[PDB]
Design a protein around this ligand. Structure first.
Ligand code: ZN
Ligand code: ZN
Ligand code: ZN
Ligand code: ZN
Ligand code: ZN
Ligand code: ZN
Ligand code: ZN
Ligand code: ZN
Lengths: 417, 420, 421, 421
């Protein structure tokens, strides 16, 4: 236990009475609306989202990085910190690894995970930066590089990520590359894409049949003119071309300004290529801010489509859920705690939508009541449900408050001078 | 002839000396660059773009419309005006019609076109507005409307456009609808798209063996929250789902801010679904401004992809070209003339690109020289080539100048009563 | 009463029990948070936003307009409909007129207003479209037109708006024009703005002592290359140049993609030039959608700045709030009703923010708790406060439900003839 | 000379014939247009833009940096490389320094510059990152930080930048900070701006009377929610507030999507606050790409506003011109060479505009001929003028060609340490 159980129990008891009052009131309110709060809490406590090992430490920009105290010094420290997030929120039992940043004896990683009560989500390859001893540079690309030997090297790296994953229980490989161009003419759009598809086909050939391959589109950065996998349209072509095991991953901050992302989510679901999500929030570009901190309604609307798919009869629908954020000016652990909470919040609210009523308003083209139907769910303060779900599962009623009362940050600051 | 042959000849003679000098000078510059100017001219004279019947009349915004003088009223007035653009530019032999706006006796339409030396490009359906006596309103959608009878009516209208097109020589139907929602929850994204696909499948069934069906995506407007056919991704799904005769149409101003449009073009080409292009320019949204008036380099880059597709003989590459613009503050005829000119200008420049050198710089990852290889082409003033092509084919050296010297606008202003 | 009181009473009685349970539950929660729900409700019931006369009629785009039934035939019908919104929401006692669309004898306008219990907010001039018998067209502009005779015509029109406003009780004139260019080179940016400043200086001379002149910026549309009053920067330059009576009006959907609108509001307030705010929502451009329907958090953040100004003891700050929307696919009256509710919703939430704690988190650079402090307020469902505020002031617990129960739309549908040409 | 004079001579002679043909051909075309090519060439060879000392090395993103061969180790190597750009293009006689990156003995800097034929442009302070042994961190801001001692430390740094500049011949200080917030509520927009203004006032007081203080606005990055100096509006307020010596710096890639940047330039000129420009190109955000590589027409339109002013008299109008780019996938020297060339290209084309004709089409509202009047100039290939200007002033006809023929990159690669990931 990263956080002393006595502290968790102490901070829960301190807020137990108020929570009971809020939960009961909400329970009565939902009962008046024909909803059993218990049924919602039950689903909420089972909603999980993977935390990024690379978000456990303070992030930075091309201009600077401002580390705080007790910065994790490696993957093992990072797992220790991730365990705090899980213990308190109970919403992040799995960690997403990134190779080579997190390279270490896989057996030891799995060992530290089991001890901490953490599992591992999809693996993440890295051919957007050069590692020491690398024969070919990814300066001008990786999986779509003009040099055959460079593409082969990139493929081998991804195959190595799969091997690592198999040793720790991972069942998927996420591939995001910076491949693209900064100048018109620098790259031939079609040939670069053909090269990418050929290299991804090789990775697919080496992909275990009990694994999935997620390709992640991004409009720009690091490439500032064109990017090979620029949007969901190219991403769909990729997944469809590679095979059933290949699906698309949607990072919320990777779209052009004003994009209707919830529609992209719906389209991918309809054609069975929605592999999963990379949650975060943003205002300008791929800001990688705490989920729901800028546009909480958009987050709700994305979950509205996920829940709608279930309501529509889509069977065995279980897209992968992962947080992909950068914490530049806050305690990384606190931001991850509240981000996971925010994701559960949007999910909970989506579960409250009166699907029958919404359906009737859509068929009758009553736009005002249709949108109001979504708002009645979104406006509902589900915090009592999120807190109770945590309390009932070993977490904290108020995670950040408990985290600070524990003095964990000061603790690791002393341990990690 | 809409414009007196004597005036065209006269306005050409007055500018022949300067054109001679510039063409020969450009010819020498290109020769030193290993390019035969005549070869470029040969291709430029064969590039055509369809003019929209709805473009020769003054356009407007939701706030107002400020008509000029001699405003064409019926499709007959419009064809007469479109004939001016073709005569002077020789780059717009075909006109794109819009139903019911241009609804008229097919036989009469065909006869008027033949008499003016004009053909007809793709038909354009209209289920984004209500016509008088219409049984079902398209307020809440058309092809994807929740009411079956409404979708049936929309489908029938499109089938009618196909019948009209067959009678006048058209070989395609372009479908752009405003279908979408203005509020979250108003529409179920998936079911709306299912209804759309189902209705489009019916239209597809009415397509003759040699016809194409073009679906056109648009991010927003008139729908301000979601749009069924919002982007090229959804558009590709439509084309792929419907079949070989279904392809995607790319309207330059229908993309999210900062979108790399030329890439979308390349992607559609690779997968054989680039049905055609709707040319115009823009800065903020679907501004529908004169092609090349805002971002001429972007236009060149789109053409760079088109010329490249040709150079490598890509399978199924044969997009239709059409201008889709609104002229709110200029003489519609002059704007279409110069827009058509800019389109040929961008094409001509793309033809100048040293493909062999570019390929080399691309393979060696010499980004600087690669972008410079494109710039050397784009920076070249190809006006002499465009002008000489027009001169040799019955057009005007300086189209707008000849148009103004002819006094055409004043002529039709006298024949067409202004509202005030 | 446009809506029968017995209908309002029956619908409120039908929802009394649920309202009581929710309001009291929320009240207890807020109490535990050290907040007096009574104090909030008292301020909410007093927050008003003007309704646009042109908003009760169905709107459209350049592609088409799909009118509903009972479209108002004129200003008098529009006033009648605005009376409905006010009666049910009690948040819209003042109406904003647009000339020449609402032109009519001022004495009659005033008479109908008083009869309905409505007042009049800022006047709105129209030089973005041509009126009949107009000696000069506004095709190439109005107040910034190259032709002096055209600018003079636009000035005289605005002066007329001021005269009408004076007779009905208005105290401000809002000026939004489409002036701009669609092509590079078409206009000399500087000279066009200089011409605009000249015309506005003239309009300014006709302002009574207690009147305000509001200039409204817009990035684009109807102009698609450049716009004279394109952003808040140019807008500030205008207000500062004209004088103490000149201030800037911020319309939510008039900004470039991703703009931080709430910051612009803070800036204008800091320099005493925030005249008013036109409320609406949008996702792509100037969509003019129902306020809070697309980005409710942004609306809350805008109010956060408004409330913070009062928190920083800003002096002489009395912004004019107005709804400026277009209802293309809904009953205009219903949308204005829920939009006004949304606006009060965001205001209520902003009042819930613990400024003391927030200021503390800001000082210590505790970004996480600072943003959470705002979220604790935004996440709060204040609907019971909004409903109780309505009940107390003679409004409806559920405005739209009550509106539909009254059969108002079908009633006016049989009294108003649509257009046939 | 960084590049052997015989190499420059040989590479010019090899292209002299074709250049003569192109220049005379263009000369004849311009004559037919009533334009004297000699008058244009004379102005072109006198147009200069400062080069960023930090743009000489390979740039990177937050994801990675892929340095090339012969990366400059310090300011002295950077100066040596900037000398290549100036010798070959003759358009970059001054270098802009960044402190503490280029911290060095002022006398050695001045000596090296004088020996290389290079001067120094505006100084650039750095309070957007922490340096070793720094007492206070700029993590939560600098000039607007909530901590008084942190603001004081930031102010002192800028004053030190001024001292260094006075010793080497600089006459301006450019201030760009990342100050802002990543979360709503983290910062109080108004208070933070007030702190920024107070700190800048202290820097202004220490500014020599013959110097200029340039504030640079940026919409976002590194701050991802709000930025203190986010746009030209706030920037104008800063400059006007600080005083006559304070002006606004416009960086092309620092504006919201679809912003009409050329209008901003016009507005700043109109109110005498256009301090200067930071040239670069972009498609998505502050991409910092080679000038004119993405939107050459936008670059021309900006120069159109500059030349219009230049032509319409406007005394004492000497905006500072600087290139601010990051070269992540090309030889930094080559990109700066072609970028400076592109900048002169836009200027030359702007000089070709028939101002009288344009004025006429604007006053007549002949939008089409107005835009075509600009296009006639923009469509003209002025490369012969740029090349001849270089040839006549000791530069190279084809800069990059000569640069490569000289084998300079291979040369410095062998004189400098190898770079790592
Ligand atoms: Zn991601
Ligand atoms: Zn990302
Ligand atoms: Zn179109
Ligand atoms: Zn359009
Ligand atoms: Zn407005
Ligand atoms: Zn507006
Ligand atoms: Zn800069
Ligand atoms: Zn920058």
């Amino acid at each position: 236990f990263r956080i002393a159980q006595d502290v968790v129990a102490r901070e829960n008891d301190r807020r137990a009475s108020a929570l009971k009052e809020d939960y009961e009131a909400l329970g009565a309110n939902l009962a008046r609306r024909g909803v059993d709060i218990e049924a919602v809490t039950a689903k909420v406590e089972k909603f999980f989202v993977a935390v990024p090992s690379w978000g456990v430490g303070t992030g930075g920009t091309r201009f600077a990085r401002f580390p705080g105290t007790g910065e994790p010094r490696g993957i093992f420290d990072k797992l220790d910190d991730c365990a705090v997030i899980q213990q308190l929120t109970r919403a992040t039992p799995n960690v997403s690894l990134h190779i080579p940043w997190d390279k270490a004896d896989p057996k030891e990683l799995k060992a530290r995970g089991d001890a901490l009560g953490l599992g591992f989500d999809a693996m993440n390859s890295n051919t957007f930066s050069d590692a020491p001893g690398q024969a070919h540079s990814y300066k001008y690309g990786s999986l779509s590089h003009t040099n055959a030997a460079t593409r082969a090297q990139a493929v081998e790296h991804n195959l190595e990520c799969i091997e690592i994953g198999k040793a720790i229980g991972s069942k998927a490989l996420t591939v995001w590359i910076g491949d693209g161009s900064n100048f018109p003419g620098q790259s031939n759009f079609t040939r670069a894409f053909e090269r990418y598809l050929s290299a991804m086909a090789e990775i697919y050939k080496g992909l275990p049949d009990d694994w999935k391959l997620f390709s992640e589109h991004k409009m720009y950065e690091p490439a500032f003119y064109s990017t090979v996998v620029q949007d969901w349209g190219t991403n769909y072509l990729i997944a469809q071309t590679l095979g059933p095991k290949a699906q698309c991953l949607v990072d919320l901050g990777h779209h052009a300004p004003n994009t209707n992302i919830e529609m992209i989510v719906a389209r991918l679901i309809q054609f069975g290529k929605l592999g999963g999500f990379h949650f975060n929030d943003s205002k300008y570009g791929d800001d990688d801010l705490d989920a729901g901190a800028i546009e909480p309604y958009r987050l709700f609307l994305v979950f509205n489509e996920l829940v709608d798919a279930e309501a529509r009869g889509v069977k065995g629908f279980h897209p992968a859920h992962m947080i992909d954020q950068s914490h530049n000016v806050t305690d990384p652990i606190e931001s991850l705690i509240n981000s996971a909470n925010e994701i559960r919040r949007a999910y909970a609210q989506a579960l409250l939508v009166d699907r029958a009523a919404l359906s009737g308003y859509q068929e009758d083209n009553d736009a005002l009541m249709a949108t109001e139907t979504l708002k009645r769910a979104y406006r509902t303060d589900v915090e009592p449900i999120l807190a109770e779900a945590r309390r009932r599962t070993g977490g904290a009623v108020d995670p950040v408050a408990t985290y600070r009362a524990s003095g964990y940050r000061a603790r690791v600051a002393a341990e990690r001078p």
